[PDB]
């Protein structure tokens with residue numbers, strides 16, 4: 001693996017082979033490549049426009065270097081993020097409903113834009129987001145749910161922290177985290193932030209070896225099933241990549257005004273979700289349920305999205321309690337009660 | 345003027361304003377921009393493809409911080425380099441013949457591609473490549489020739505050496521060289537390795553305040569007058585940029601074997617050259633004459649491309665003697681003669 005040959009190759013706008021990319025990624029994440037060259041590379045890759053092999057290459061590298069646990073049968077609902085509209089922490093909430101009928105390995109980080117980060121609500125809720133791997137497995141067995149805090153499950157990325165911060169621009173590492181679930185979940189719902197990444201990441205995904213992963217991009221430009229209108233999807237499986245366009249009305253609901261689904265703090269997000277669980281905020285609930293319906297489909301638990309939406313209705317009614325047993329086994333329920341009160 | 349804004353601008357592939365480039369180049373050459381961003385900026389600037397205005401901005405920044413000497417009437421023959429052929433140092437040689445008729449302020453550096461660096465030959469021929477401004481003035485009056493070592497007349501450029509070396513790829517700075525003659529020569533024959541850069545550089549030079557500078561691209565893929573076929577050149581002055589296409593034959597000569605114009609070290613170049621001066625290397629000598637010919641057309645001491653080849657035919661006969669006096673005034677004549685002995 002010659003750093004120079006690689007760089008010159010990217011500069012000429014030639015895509016790498018999966019293996020070149022993986023060795024390249026491996027060197028960078030290991031800390032064996034001078035910052036000047038990591039910067040050059042990340043910048044070259046972006047201006048060339050990353051290709052499938054490249055994504056595949058880097059993903060495989062990151063999985064390899066990441067702290068792992070084995071729960072392939074699990075499902076994750078992490079999205080790439082980056083839309084920055086501060087919407088409520090949907091997929092996290094949605095991860096609570098899923099754990100009721102299937103092991104859930106929720107991968108995520110704290111907020112980058114705003115403060116509605118997956119790891120932040122869980123914290124605001126009473127959950128102890130920093131879980132050691134040996135414990136992580138125990139929890140998923142006892143409660144069917146664990147949150148895998150990325151910073152900690154991908155310690156190696158520390159060797160790229162300075163370049164990324166100094167560069168202060170989006171790079172290939174901004175859309176890779178969801179393809180790197182630390183527990184190797186084979187089923188997942190991952191939202192991307194642009195129609196273009198929907199095409200690239202689904203093609204990449206097709207080779208990262210999932211049983212079923214559903215990539216989505218919903219209007220007005222968030223990485224979720226769209227709560228106001230259309231949702232562009234890609235259902236990936238050993239069979240291929242299926243294209244599917246969906247409107248929020250297909251779930252049998254009227255479009256939800258998005259201002260209703262936007263938060264301004266972690267606690268505010270937590271309250272939105274509990275109130276949703278408690279039936280005191282139909283809007284957030286419909287948002288949590290349209291996302292869960294797509295996840296449920298990924299698991300092959302329903303025949304269509306409507307069935308998925310109705311089924312999700314039965315899950316949300318048991319989620320508050322579910323949330324309580326999960327947080328009791330790994331956190332502080334008094335914080336959950338406080339949040340509950342704060343929403344009654 | 346913010347670096348992060350410049351970076352976003354380039355990542356977006358938008359060309360900079362001359363003023364912007366100049367301030368950007370200033371900070372970089374002044375060593376006040378973090379190596380990480382300098383790497384990114386240089387890479388993006390290359391992938392986007394540099395613009396006439398960016399070239400002009402950097403050139404002006406560099407010129408401003410360079411150390412200078414007064415000799416505008418002088419002529420130079422430095423080329424962009426980087427054609428990857430390892431050919432023999434023709435313009436350094438072509439400069440020797442020129443000092444026979446016009447003061448020569450030759451700008452150059454050590455090789456990045458082989459050893460065939462114009463500065464390396466001289467070192468090998470016995471010349472003392474580091475010439476202080478005061479001494480340089482003296483040498484040009486007496487011998488009518490002087491070498492301006494880029495690494496000495498551009499002391500600030502050392503603030504970009506680590507990034508450039510670490511990168512190990514060509515950037516904007518690898519084409520700015522000949523446009524920043526320390527003696528501010530108003531005349532010269534600028535060689536370029538690609539027809540594309542031939543256009544960019546010609547248009548840029550037009551605004552760089554020259555009396556007459558001829559840019560040339562050699563058919564085989566060399567940045568000199570072609571020894572095997574066509575030569576594309578632009579005659580830029582204050583009145584415009586003329587288009588001109590040549591063939592080795594228009595010099596009344598025949599195609600020359602590039603196989604014999606190739607060198608594999610500083611000394612082989614120093615030998616091919618002296619060998620041609622001794623009239624013992626028909627081919628090397630022909631390659632020199634044709635370039636010299638164009639450079640004479642530039643000084644307007646010949647109004648015909650074949651008349652210049654004829655005039656060059658004279659000059660080479662007195663060449664060795666000139667080289668001899670040049671070396672004994674600023675250097676070690678010993679070396680030179682051992683080379684003569686090795687050229688027989």
Ligand SMILES: O=P(O)(O)OC[C@H]1O[C@H](OP(=O)(O)OP(=O)(O)O)[C@H](O)[C@@H]1O
Pocket residue numbers: 077078079080081082083084085086087088089090091092093107108109116117118119190191192222223224
């Ligand atoms: O900024 P957003 O509109 O939220 O988009 C980013 C992602 O976050 C949402 O879930 P959650 O809040 O749990 O975040 P995560 O997917 O990043 O963990 C949702 O599932 C998106 O995929």
Ligand SMILES: O=P(O)(O)OC[C@H]1O[C@H](OP(=O)(O)OP(=O)(O)O)[C@H](O)[C@@H]1O
Pocket residue numbers: 421422423424425426427428429430431432433434435436437451452453460461462534535536566567568
């Ligand atoms: O790689 P090359 O085929 O040599 O082309 C690069 C330049 O070098 C040649 O002269 P010289 O060898 O003296 O180098 P210089 O122009 O860098 O001084 C010639 O003037 C070219 O313009």
Ligand SMILES: [Mg+2]
Pocket residue numbers: 077078079090091092191223
């Ligand atoms: Mg999400």
Ligand SMILES: [Mg+2]
Pocket residue numbers: 079081087090191222223224
């Ligand atoms: Mg989201």
Ligand SMILES: [Mg+2]
Pocket residue numbers: 421422423424425434435436535
């Ligand atoms: Mg040259």
Ligand SMILES: [Mg+2]
Pocket residue numbers: 423425431434535566567568
């Ligand atoms: Mg050359």
